[PDB]
Write a protein that binds this ligand. Structure first.
Ligand SMILES: Nc1ncnc2c1ncn2[C@@H]1O[C@H](COP(=O)(O)OP(=O)(O)OP(O)(O)=S)[C@@H](O)[C@H]1O
Lengths: 59, 181, 194, 295, 159, 527, 218
């Protein structure tokens, strides 16, 4: 997947630590919009932010 | 990997190079860019000559905040004496500002309003002198052999476009010649 | 008739250059002919198997004759020739993909798997260098020098849509905007006029 | 006169809307009357067929005097106007009117409910070609629309003659009513503007006036999409003889009938004068339109 | 090497007879072919075939393409001569052959021919009829480059 | 005066400037290096330039032609310095009311002439006093001649001047002849005129095209009633890279075969096998130049024997309209269309005129009424399609010529549809060797299918009325934008590709010819 | 150390880079200080973000600043990508040049991003040629380098090739012997020679010393 994190960062900015923002940017990075990325990011203590961002058979 | 040219510079790239040229202007005002090389200067008095790089003048002209002075060297009578000197000099390619081609192209885009009747006047002259220069290049070009190439005086643009030809040929000549030994 | 398969493949490469000349660059390499490669392998395998055979027999019935060494020396060159053809072929074959890896990243299926393996590792490697700079580069795109500064672009089948502000991409709506965001959207083909 | 600079004076009158009803060009009677006007002009038929560019200089300079000395016979005395003409120099001058007709023609050609919306999308797609067309330097595209304008006017005047033979007009006292339920080249009729000028071309034709009591015309057509039958309002044109603030009538009537059962009715058209209606339901819509007549 | 022209250049077959007996004909079921049998052979192999001995393995008979009739014919009127039918790889080929044989005269000849060809090829370059078809490969490639250079130059003048 | 006109056109090329670009000086600067020695000027741009200039050209063309030739050569000398032997250029531009005037027109080429020659510059000599002068000439169509005086006085008289032939200069001359259009006003025999061509226009068009010619309708006198034959001097004949881009685009689509079978006969429903074989005829196969003493044949042949009413006639007409060069013939009996011509007569000279296979060398020949034809020169047709070698051993000439044609047939068996109710042969009364020398044989049948019958009915009513099948414009927007497009594509297709079969496919045909010959064994030996 | 001259030398070295057929010393001593300075001014955006805060004028140098930033960033992009390309074409020979003792090793002076991309690219390249054609790797053919004949992986150290050059050099107020200008050199032919006002195209080898000395423009 292709993204530009410098563009991503001011959007993420709207304080937040760089480690948390960078971590969520990396993890959410695989999921991409057209983009829809803004819609998923706006949905998102440190523990709550960290948990909120995360979101053998038979033939 | 752009691959183009890769030996020649793109025409727009040489235009990017000529962006660096300083030029005099007449601002409408009566700053402190930290970027790289301007370092100057305090708010300039209106209609007063001050030297500034080309692209910023292009900006100010786009906002019409400056009055560009026409370059003194570009005067029809001077091109007439140049063409005169050309008809009598089969070899020498004498004087050219060397960047003048792109300048004139740009100056006629916007700066056209300041000049006194350049319209249907110097435009023909520059074209005429241009082509006679091109053919004089061709006449000296028939003489081409290693190891000397007479580069004397020419605007960088034409030198760039003619580059692939001569550059790739001379190598063959040298190779076959030295190789024959 | 002998190194003939090499001639056909090298020739196809030569044509593929011209196929890519203007072109517009729509270049989608037709296929990897591995059947011909198999034929090369069968010929070399037969050749070096006989070569090793005579190399062994040289101590018994050939008795290391001077003329016998010539055929080894011949086949060795022929081998290099074959090699040379495949090397250059693949090198260009690789090169064109490399170019396609650069231009549109950015910011198939018919071709042989080894290429995609190399490709995925190549693109991962170039992303490693993009991570290194941290300059920023942005080295794969932005080939044309900018001016001045704003441009008018029209939408190309994009609706859509976000960087710095959400601009609400709307199909068939032309704007007047700075080069910056346009550079990103053009990589996806979403913008048309420049 | 229309398409003056890019076409033959002959075709100019032939396709002229103003000259049309007065000379009754669809009918054969005025045909000889037209040649009679040229016989007054002393112009050879072959001379009229040549392009305006290659016609003799004498014919040029004397054109207005000849017009002053001939056209008055048919009551055309009030025509010559001091209207503005652009000078772009080397490629030639054009009156603003002609460029307007060409650009609007460029607007209309030169390009379940999903197909209709898709076509609406294509109409908006043709707008940017026109917005791009507004520049002076881009002449390449402009000449195509300039000539296609002639192709339209040809089809207009042709279908017009077809309507003239059947006399489908219902000359009622309340209002005149018509409908084109079938005919050749109906695709061009999809654009409301086609029918706008078409209606205008009829409105001045049927009534010059031609006393008395100018009346509104009804028009519609449909091909697919289950009897769309776009019906656009039309208003009479006075021949200079705004005498009164008449303007329009229909907005209130559309509000009254659309306030009834309004089954299948679609007010989707941005302009209030045109509405889509089923023919099955267009007939009672007409009945309710006749009475109670708001006018 | 990796240049397409290299394998292309070595691909042409050259009629050079060997000096010795040759068992194992690579081209018939003799098996050994008697010495001085003239056979066309690829430049890559035949190039170094006689290089190994110190007597060379191949006589290296003179090329038919380099015949005196050809060489003087080209010395006459270069503009009209057609190189495309005879080889068509010529400068790039002849340099290889001339390296093997090491003659200084014809090199000095061909160079002038190339110069005039260059003159002429640059004359068609500004913007036919049938000549443009007979040009050798290298000059063709340069022609494409030169064409885009000028097209783009004048286009660069306006838009 | 004289030079003012030269000055006006030099002030035209050098001192015209539209928005940011001057065009005509660039035209001449391109043409000299190209070695054109010519120039083209759009007269409509000239009318766009000035008003007095155009009426001046309008009045006297014979007088103003040299001021153009002078303005051409004076500018040409600066670029000539920029570029020894350099002549004056020729510009090429594109009844009682028409004598000697600027008129454009259009027609069809009847017959050309052999490249002839008038003179341009020439020097004379006094045979006694040795007095020499020189005169250059342009309008070779009477005005002046050689004087009869030694001129050193200004008695050797009369005319002492002898034309020096070793130091003269010459040009070429064509002399076409044109024929009226076969669609309009022949309500007669076809009429014709006489053409005459100048310098770079020579040897340009092989006859048969439908063309437009800009001309000067002037009058000459040669062969007391003032009988003069009129003629039209030709100025600017016009004929019949990005396209390569769209050509490559159209070449690789896998639906090309069908979209071409949506391009040939839109007026005709059905007959899809015929509709397909026409596609293969307009392209032409390979051409083998073997060490063998002969070469083989490339183009193919189409037969349409069958029941009447099929409109195979309309199909063969449209075949003639698609190919660039082709000959359509309807039967053995004409009003005016012939087939090795033998012309015996002025100067008592035998000469070769032409025919029909000669025009269609490398094209399509359409023969209607295959069974309504005589055996008078049929033998030439029995050979022209197989070995491409017409021999002539008559009283005039003794040559062996070339004929690269392809013949298209449209027959009718005897008694119509009943020929298939008796034994399936019984069609050609002579023999079956002519059909063996053809390629494709098709039999058109007539079977009732009510849905097919209703479809062919309303399909044809829609063709006549209400332009329902004629929807084509959106089809143009989606498929086969033009016929002329197909023609330009075939021109590009014939000389570029060098087709040949593939070695893995050859064993398939070898195994298949066995099955067809076995099929004939089954139907023959047991019967 | 002056930004004006640094930028001058930037465009200078960029031109020199693109013209030169083969590799040149890596100027980390300069490249680094500039990459830092640009990031300084680049971050220095802050006044623009603080400008929205004053809301409950002249942005001309603002976007001009930003413009020149990205503009110069373009220049360096072409520069670096060009070096990378050159390395891709010269990779086998450059590693072989690393193998040799004399003179100057690849390392960092002459060549960090580069060496990484070099070794990694060459690595996966070897994996791509190896897994494809050399499997199927005859005993003698196992080596991918010069056999010799013919040859390979020796290309292309050609210094003999002609290229355009322009005489320019630091003035005394040395090798200027007069009368008009400097300086005096082919192996088989003599000096021509040179003048500061005109470009004389000749062999890239004889002028190599001057490029190392910075005595001739390209
Ligand atoms: N789809 C169609 N099928 C058949 N005839 C058609 C069709 N459309 C139009 N026609 C017309 O009907 C005529 C039928 O005659 P043809 O089809 O020419 O019969 P024919 O078999 O050619 O008889 P010939 O010419 O002597 S072999 C045509 O010539 C056309 O004028």
């Amino acid at each position: 997947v292709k993204i530009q994190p410098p563009l991503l960062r001011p959007l993420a900015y709207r304080s937040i630590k760089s480690d948390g923002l960078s971590a969520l940017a990396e993890f959410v990075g695989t999921n991409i919009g057209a983009p829809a990325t803004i819609k998923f990011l706006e949905q998102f203590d440190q523990s709550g932010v960290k948990e909120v961002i995360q979101e053998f058979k038979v033939i | 990997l752009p691959a183009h040219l890769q030996q020649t510079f793109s025409p727009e790239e040489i235009q990017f190079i000529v962006e660096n040229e300083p030029i005099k202007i007449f601002p409408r005002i009566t700053w402190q860019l930290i970027t790289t090389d301007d370092k100057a200067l305090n708010n300039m008095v209106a209609m007063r000559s001050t030297e500034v790089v080309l692209w910023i003048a292009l900006l100010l002209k786009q906002q019409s905040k400056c009055s560009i002075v026409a370059p003194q060297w570009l005067t029809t009578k001077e091109l007439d004496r140049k063409i005169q000197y050309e008809k009598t000099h089969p070899d020498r390619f004498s004087e050219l500002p060397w960047n003048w081609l792109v300048l004139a192209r740009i100056l006629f885009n916007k700066a056209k309003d300041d000049f006194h009747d350049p319209i249907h006047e110097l435009r023909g002259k520059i074209q005429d002198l241009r082509e006679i220069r091109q053919i004089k290049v061709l006449k000296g070009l028939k003489y081409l052999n290693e190891s000397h190439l007479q580069l004397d005086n020419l605007s960088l643009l034409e030198i760039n476009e003619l580059r692939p030809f001569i550059t790739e040929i001379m190598d063959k000549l040298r190779e076959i010649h030295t190789a024959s030994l | 008739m002998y190194g003939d398969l090499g001639n056909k493949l090298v020739l196809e490469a030569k044509r593929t250059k011209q196929l890519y000349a203007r072109s517009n660059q729509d270049v989608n390499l037709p296929m990897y002919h591995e059947d011909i490669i198999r034929n090369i392998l069968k010929e070399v395998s037969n050749l070096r198997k006989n070569t090793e055979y005579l190399k062994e027999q040289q101590q018994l019935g050939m008795l290391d004759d001077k003329v016998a060494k010539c055929q080894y020396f011949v086949t060795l060159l022929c081998m290099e020739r074959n090699k040379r053809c495949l090397l250059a072929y693949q090198r260009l074959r690789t090169d064109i993909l490399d170019s396609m890896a650069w231009n549109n990243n950015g910011l198939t299926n018919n071709l042989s798997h080894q290429e995609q393996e190399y490709l995925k590792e190549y693109c991962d490697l170039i992303t490693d260098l993009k991570s290194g700079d941290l300059v920023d580069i942005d080295l794969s795109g932005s080939l044309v020098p900018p001016s001045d500064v704003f441009i008018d672009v029209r939408v190309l089948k994009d609706a859509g849509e976000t960087e710095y502000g959400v601009f609400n991409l709307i199909k068939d709506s032309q704007f007047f905007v700075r080069q910056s965001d346009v550079e990103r959207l053009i990589q996806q083909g979403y913008l048309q006029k420049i | 006169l229309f398409l003056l600079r890019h076409s033959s004076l002959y075709d100019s009158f032939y396709y002229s809307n103003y000259v049309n009803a007065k000379l009754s060009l669809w009918n054969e009677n005025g045909k000889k009357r037209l040649h009679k006007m040229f016989a007054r002009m002393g112009i050879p038929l072959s001379t009229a067929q040549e392009t305006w560019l290659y016609m003799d200089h004498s014919i040029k300079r004397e054109l207005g005097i000849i017009f002053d000395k001939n056209l008055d016979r048919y009551g055309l005395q009030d025509i010559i106007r001091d209207g503005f003409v652009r000078t772009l120099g080397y490629r030639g001058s054009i009156s603003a009117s002609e460029f307007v007709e060409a650009l609007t023609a460029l607007l209309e050609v030169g390009n379940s409910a999903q197909k209709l919306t898709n076509l609406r999308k294509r109409w908006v797609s043709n707008f940017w070609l026109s917005w791009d067309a507004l520049d002076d330097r881009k002449v390449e595209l402009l000449n195509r629309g300039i000539q296609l304008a002639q192709d339209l006017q040809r089809a207009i005047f042709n279908t017009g003659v077809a309507i003239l033979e059947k006399k489908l007009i219902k000359h009622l006292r309340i209002y005149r009513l018509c409908v084109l339920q079938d005919g050749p080249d109906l695709d061009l009729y999809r654009n409301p503007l086609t029918l706008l000028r078409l209606g205008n071309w009829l409105i001045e034709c049927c009534a010059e006036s031609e006393d008395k009591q100018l009346l509104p015309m009804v028009l519609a057509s449909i091909d697919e999409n289950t009897d769309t039958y776009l019906v656009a309002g039309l208003t009479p044109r006075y021949p200079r003889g705004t005498k009164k603030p008449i303007l329009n009538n229909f907005s209130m009537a559309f509000q009254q009938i659309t306030a009834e059962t309004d089954a299948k009715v679609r007010i989707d058209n941005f302009e209030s004068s045109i509405i889509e209606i089923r023919r099955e339901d267009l007939s009672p819509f007409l009945e309710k339109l006749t009475l109670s007549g708001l006018l | 090497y990796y240049d397409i022209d290299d394998v292309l250049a070595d691909g042409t077959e050259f009629p050079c007879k060997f000096q010795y007996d040759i068992p194992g004909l690579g081209y018939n079921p003799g098996r050994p072919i008697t010495k001085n049998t003239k056979l066309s052979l690829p430049l890559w192999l035949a190039r170094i075939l006689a290089i190994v001995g110190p007597v060379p393995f191949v006589e290296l008979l003179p090329p038919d393409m380099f015949s005196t009739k050809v060489m003087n014919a080209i010395k006459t009127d270069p503009v009209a001569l057609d190189l495309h039918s005879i080889n068509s790889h010529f400068f790039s080929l002849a340099i290889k052959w001339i390296m093997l044989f090491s003659e200084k005269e014809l090199a000095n000849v061909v160079s002038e021919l190339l110069l005039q060809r260059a003159q002429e090829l640059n004359h068609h370059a500004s913007s036919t009829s049938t000549f443009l078809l007979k040009l050798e490969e290298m000059e063709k490639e340069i022609y494409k480059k030169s064409h885009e250079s000028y097209k783009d130059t004048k286009r660069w003048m306006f838009k | 005066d004289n030079t003012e006109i030269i000055k006006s056109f030099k002030n035209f090329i050098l001192e015209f400037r539209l928005d940011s670009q001057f065009i005509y000086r660039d035209q001449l600067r391109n043409n000299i290096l190209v070695k054109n020695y010519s120039l083209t000027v759009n007269m409509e741009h000239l009318i766009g330039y000035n008003e007095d200039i155009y009426k001046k050209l309008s009045d006297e063309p014979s007088d103003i032609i040299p001021l153009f030739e002078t303005a051409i050569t004076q500018v040409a000398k600066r670029i000539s310095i920029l570029s020894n032997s350099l002549p004056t250029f020729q510009l090429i531009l594109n009844d009682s009311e028409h004598v000697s005037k600027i008129v454009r027109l259009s027609g069809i080429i009847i017959s050309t002439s052999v490249l002839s020659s008038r003179a341009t510059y020439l020097s004379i000599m006094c045979r006694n006093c040795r007095h020499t002068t020189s005169i250059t000439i342009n309008n070779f169509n009477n005005t002046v001649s050689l004087p009869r005086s030694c001129l050193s006085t200004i008695n050797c008289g009369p005319d002492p001047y002898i034309i020096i032939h070793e130091s003269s200069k010459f040009i070429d001359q064509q002399f076409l002849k044109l024929q009226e259009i076969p669609e309009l006003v022949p309500v007669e025999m076809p009429r014709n005129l006489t053409m005459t061509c100048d310098r770079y226009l020579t040897n340009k068009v092989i006859p048969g095209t439908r063309v437009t010619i800009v001309g000067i309708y002037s009058i000459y006198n040669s062969k007391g009633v003032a009988i003069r034959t009129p003629y039209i001097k030709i100025l600017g004949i016009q004929s019949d890279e990005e396209e390569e881009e769209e050509f490559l685009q159209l070449s690789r689509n896998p639906k090309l075969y069908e979209i071409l079978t949506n391009s040939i006969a839109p007026s005709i429903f059905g007959n899809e096998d015929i509709k397909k074989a026409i596609v293969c005829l307009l392209m032409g196969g390979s051409k083998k130049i073997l060490p063998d003493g002969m070469r083989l044949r490339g183009d193919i042949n189409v037969l349409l024997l069958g029941d009447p009413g099929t409109a195979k006639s309309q199909l063969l007409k449209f075949v003639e309209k698609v190919s660039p060069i082709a000959v359509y013939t309807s039967g053995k009996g004409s009003s005016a269309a012939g087939l090795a011509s033998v012309q015996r007569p002025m100067t008592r000279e035998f000469y070769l005129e032409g025919g029909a296979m000669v025009l269609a060398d490398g094209g399509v020949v359409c023969i209607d009424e295959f069974d309504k034809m005589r055996d008078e020169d049929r033998v030439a047709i029995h050979e022209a399609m197989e070995q491409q070698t017409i021999s002539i051993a008559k009283a005039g000439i003794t040559t062996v010529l070339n004929s690269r044609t392809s013949v298209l047939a449209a027959a009718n068996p005897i008694y119509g549809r009943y020929d298939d109710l008796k034994s399936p042969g019984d069609n050609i009364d002579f023999q079956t060797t002519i059909l063996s020398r053809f390629d494709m044989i098709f039999i058109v049948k007539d079977d009732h299918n009510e849905e097919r019958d209703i479809s062919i009915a309303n399909h044809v009513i829609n063709i006549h009325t209400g332009n329902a099948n004629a929807q084509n414009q959106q089809e143009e927007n989606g498929s086969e934008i033009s016929i002329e497009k197909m023609k330009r594509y075939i021109t590009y297709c014939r000389l570029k590709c060098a087709p040949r079969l593939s070695p893995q496919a050859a064993e398939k045909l070898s195994s298949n010819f066995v099955t067809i010959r076995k099929q004939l064994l089954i139907n023959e030996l047991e019967s | 150390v002056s930004p004006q001259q640094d930028f001058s030398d930037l465009m200078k070295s960029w031109k020199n880079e693109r013209c030169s057929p083969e590799l040149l010393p890596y100027p980390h001593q300069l490249m680094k200080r500039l990459l830092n300075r640009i990031s300084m001014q680049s971050q220095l955006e802050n006044i623009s973000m603080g400008f929205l805060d004053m809301q409950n004028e002249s942005k001309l140098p603002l976007l001009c600043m930003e413009t020149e930033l990205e503009r110069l960033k373009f220049v360096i992009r072409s520069y670096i990508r060009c070096r990378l390309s050159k390395i891709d074409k010269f990779s086998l020979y450059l590693r072989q040049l690393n193998e040799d003792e004399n003179s100057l090793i690849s390392l960092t002076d002459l060549l960090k991003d580069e060496i990484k991309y070099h070794d990694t690219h060459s690595l996966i390249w070897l994996k791509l040629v190896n897994d494809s054609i050399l499997k199927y790797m005859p005993e003698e053919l196992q080596a991918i380098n010069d056999t010799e004949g013919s040859v390979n992986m020796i290309d292309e150290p050609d210094w003999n090739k002609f290229v355009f050059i322009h005489v320019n050099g630091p003035p005394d107020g040395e090798n200027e012997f007069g009368k008009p200008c400097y300086t005096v050199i082919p192996d088989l032919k003599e000096e021509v020679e040179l003048t500061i006002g005109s470009i004389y195209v000749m062999r890239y080898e004889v002028i190599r010393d001057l490029l190392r000395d910075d005595k001739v423009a390209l």
